[PDB]
Amino acid sequence: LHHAVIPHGKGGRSSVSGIVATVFGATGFLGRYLVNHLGRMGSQVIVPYRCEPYDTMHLRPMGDLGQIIFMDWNGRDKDSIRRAVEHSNVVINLVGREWETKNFDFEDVFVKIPQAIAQVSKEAGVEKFIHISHLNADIKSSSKYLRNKAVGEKEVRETFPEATIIKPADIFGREDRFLNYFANIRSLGKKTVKQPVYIVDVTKGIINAIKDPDARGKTFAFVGPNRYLLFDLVQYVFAVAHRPWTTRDKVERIHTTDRTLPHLPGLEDLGVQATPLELKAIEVLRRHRTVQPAKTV
Amino acid sequence: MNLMITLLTNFTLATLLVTIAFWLPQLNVYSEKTSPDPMGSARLPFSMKFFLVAITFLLFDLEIALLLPLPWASQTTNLNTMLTMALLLIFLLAVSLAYEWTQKGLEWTE
Ligand SMILES: NC(=O)C1=CN([C@@H]2O[C@H](COP(=O)(O)OP(=O)(O)OC[C@H]3O[C@@H](n4cnc5c(N)ncnc54)[C@H](OP(=O)(O)O)[C@@H]3O)[C@@H](O)[C@H]2O)C=CC1
């Protein structure tokens, strides 16, 4: 171990945590709270950004001086990825889109970018790699999202054999697109079962997978403590939020049930107590205000 | 007809400007804001004084409504009667003001 990366201090803001993290896609919903929780330990966080630097401003209070290093990257360029990962001891991949664009489809985002990041981090001497897939990823799935995400999971597992793959089901938080999608839709009720996981639990799980050496090469499934049907979940969201842009792929993924994977470990094996929806859904949905809790299965 | 077309055109232009001002900045995708005053949560207490100056306006505006045909009333052939009633109406507006003065009516909106 090198001398500059030995953990010192009391784990606060100006301490040293020994984590040199490269978070691809840190300018999103999960990268926000991940760079927050890494920066409060005193980690050297490298944020490659595609967007305007203005859209990185909220990542700047998250650490001490010189702790977040912003740099440009292209998702089709291995050279900028190598420029961003050649000093890191852990590489987290959070690059994703709910919809396809003209320049990037689901295959450009979920398959080629994670394979490129994991392969270039394999040839750069990175110890720890973390890939974030979806719990309902399947090759023969109805949605192109989950199909290309399962293919990208398979490619990351075959190009970085020690990679930690993480399956959150449907993450809710303040900047999510799960409870805020339901609160503004004003689609229906079906036989779909969902267990949503909370974003601070996902972030604590990602960090406890960074710190654990026994999480190398595992596949985790981050799920909440309660499975809900889709209809009474949506009605409970309308009940908390005091109420009476889309694609067909999002509709295919809301009406797809969250699969139970008992053979994969979860948040309880990373020391994370799963926070239920009834404690944090008010914190999420107090924004939408101008309550009987939902029945499980 | 020309006046109605002009009113319709001005209302249409104002509606189009308010429509642009409520549709054009909405097409920016910036960020949704979480957790979106001198008094905390209290009821607005009713003030007697603002209601008094409102009713005083209403009564003197009625007296103005009586005074408004004077530029036409000065053309009459009964000018002694007309001058007497014109001076009488402006004097009654002044007596309403003097009674509003002297009985502590114009207070803290003086
Ligand atoms: N409900 C959830 O949140 C769940 C999410 N996941 C997965 O977790 C990951 C992160 O989730 P989330 O925060 O919600 O996603 P976001 O859309 O909020 O964040 C995606 C990040 O990746 C960047 N990015 C997107 N497309 C590209 C691209 N083509 N090239 C380069 N950078 C790109 C975005 O930057 P920019 O601002 O420039 O677009 C942003 O920084 C995703 O892979 C998602 O599939 C898994 C399970 C559940």
DSSP string, B47-85: PHHHHHHHHHHHHHHHHHHHHTTHHHHTT-S-HHHHHHH
A58: nearest CA in chain B? B31
Which residue matches tokens 């630097």?
Answer: A53
- Collapse the DSSP code of A53 into the 3-class scheme (helix H, G, I; strand E, B; otherwise coil) and give the result: helix
Q: State the residue range of the domain holding A167.
A: 1-297
Q: How far is the CA of A139 from the centre of ligand 1 (A)?
A: 20
Atom of ligand 1 nearest to the CA of A31: 13
Q: Can you tell me the distance from the alpha carbon of A196 to that of A180, in angstroms, rounded to the nearest whole number?
A: 13
Which residue matches tokens 């897939």?
Answer: A133
Question: Chain A partners of B34 at a C-beta cutoff of 8 Å?
Answer: 174-175, 287
Residues lining ligand 1, Cβ inside 6 A: A 25-31, 50-51, 75, 94-97, 104, 109, 132, 134, 168, 170-171, 178
| Selected residue of A51, A181, A287 to mutate for chain B interface (largest B Cβ count, 10 A) | A287
CB A143 within 8 A of CB A253: yes
Q: How far is the CA of A97 from the centre of ligand 1 (A)?
A: 5
- Collapse the DSSP code of A290 into the 3-class scheme (helix H, G, I; strand E, B; otherwise coil) and give the result: coil
Q: How far is the CA of A109 from the centre of ligand 1 (A)?
A: 9
Q: How far is the CA of A98 from the centre of ligand 1 (A)?
A: 8
| Angle (CA) B13 B18 B24, round 5° | 115
Q: Which pair of structure tokens corresponds to residue A272? A: 């994370």
| Angle (CA) A48 A52 A55, round 5° | 85
Q: Which pair of structure tokens corresponds to residue A115? A: 């394979």
Q: In A, residues 175-204, which contact B (CB 8 Å cutoff)? A: 175, 180
The experimental technique used to determine this model is: cryo-EM
CB A98 within 8 A of CB A247: yes
Q: Can you tell me the distance from the alpha carbon of B110 to that of B104, in angstroms, rounded to the nearest whole number?
A: 9
Report how many domains make up chain A: 1
Mark A164-187 as b/e (b = at least 16 C-beta within 10 Å). bbbbbbbbbbbebebbbbbbeeee
Closest protein CA for atom 36 of ligand 1: A51
Orientation of helix A277-285 relative to helix A230-240, angle to 10°: 50
How many C-beta neighbours within 10 Å does residue A76 have?
Answer: 13
Question: Chain B partners of A287 at a C-beta cutoff of 8 Å?
Answer: 32-36
Which residue matches tokens 């809900």?
Answer: A228
Residues pairing with A166 in the sheet: A132, A220
Q: Which pair of structure tokens corresponds to residue A41? A: 């330990």
Q: Which pair of structure tokens corresponds to residue A49? A: 């950004």
CB A8 within 8 A of CB A16: yes
Q: In A, residues 38-77, which contact B (CB 8 Å cutoff)? A: none
Q: Can you tell me the distance from the alpha carbon of B90 to that of B87, in angstroms, rounded to the nearest whole number?
A: 5
Q: Which pair of structure tokens corresponds to residue A262? A: 């008992």
- Collapse the DSSP code of A167 into the 3-class scheme (helix H, G, I; strand E, B; otherwise coil) and give the result: strand
Question: Chain A partners of B28 at a C-beta cutoff of 8 Å?
Answer: none
Q: A104: burial class by Cβ within 10 Å (0-12, 13-18, 19+)?
A: middle
- Which is it for the CA torsion A24, A30, A32, A35, positive or negative? negative
Residue B42's contacts (CB-CB under 8 Å, 6 or more residues apart) are none
